[PDB]
Design brief:
4 copies of one chain form a homotetramer.
Chain A: E1 2-9, H1 14-28, E2 35-42, E3 53-61, H2 65-73, H3 76-79, E4 83-91
Antiparallel strand pairs in A: 1-3, 1-4, 2-3
């Protein structure tokens, strides 16, 4: 199955994002082929640098909701309390 | 610029989606170039057919927030009153 | 019926909120009797002043989804394009 | 601090809600005095009974984001894997 995974940072938790970004990126690495599209949501302005990140979006291939939840739970970002909003949706290409 | 566009149907409004899906697809058609990813969110169970659709997701290229809002507003789905939730985010590939 | 009405400002649009706050409050005034709970969402830190506003939340009584949706469309804040996210939910007290 | 806590059930998990509702409510009971508003989101139609529930909304007083997140995590509904979406927002009465 495919899932949308949409997560928005707590307001001014930017530092938590920057401090944990490398670990989060390393966490995604072994899952690459299962991750079809992924990248950070961005804030005010037109900047696309690290300081403009406000959250994470991914489309994830997984065999169950249990798998997705467990993937979310063990994200370094999740363990560090970075997120204020998390939305997960079963999904398909159109 | 890249934008996440997330919309969820009002609960109970599947038929509104069904009756208007063709018009919705026709509206998206000229924009194929600008749309990097597209598809519906899906509901309960494991089915991936039309009657499982519960919403719409796009990643789209646009020059402004104005352009994105205009695109959202002119969707046949919008005027049809289909959506109870709309989320737009500026976004980039990781 | 009762509805949750949840709206988040577009990042960087604080100025649009300031410019339209008066008209927005004017718009809510006649409908004061239908609004059970109302207030702005807040951003980073612990401040609770105008400059801390990041969005709008309401619990409102309406006779139908059409009434709620129209109430949302006619908001000065809507017509000014302040919001990046809007979520409406049918709801009841516990 | 006041927080909006918005949580939507995974599609088709109504029976998980029904089976655990009592344990969820007993969880909320000791914290009654910190909760200003609470009740479930409702789905399609106009029914307002148990089978209509689709999520949980709360406005709650807490001393920190970490307290809110710990509150949420220890909810019997959380541990049952009921929720697909969770949104938390710092907030104030207008």
């Amino acid at each position: 199955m495919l899932f949308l995974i949409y997560r928005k940072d707590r307001p001014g938790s930017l530092q938590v994002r920057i401090d944990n970004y490398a670990a989060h990126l390393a966490y995604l690495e072994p899952l690459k082929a299962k991750i079809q599209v992924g990248g950070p949501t961005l804030g005010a302005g037109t900047g696309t640098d690290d300081k403009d990140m406000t959250g994470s979006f991914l489309i994830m291939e997984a065999e169950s909701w249990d798998e997705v939840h467990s993937f979310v739970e063990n994200d370094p970002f999740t363990k560090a309390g970075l997120f204020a909003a998390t939305i997960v949706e079963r999904w398909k290409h159109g």
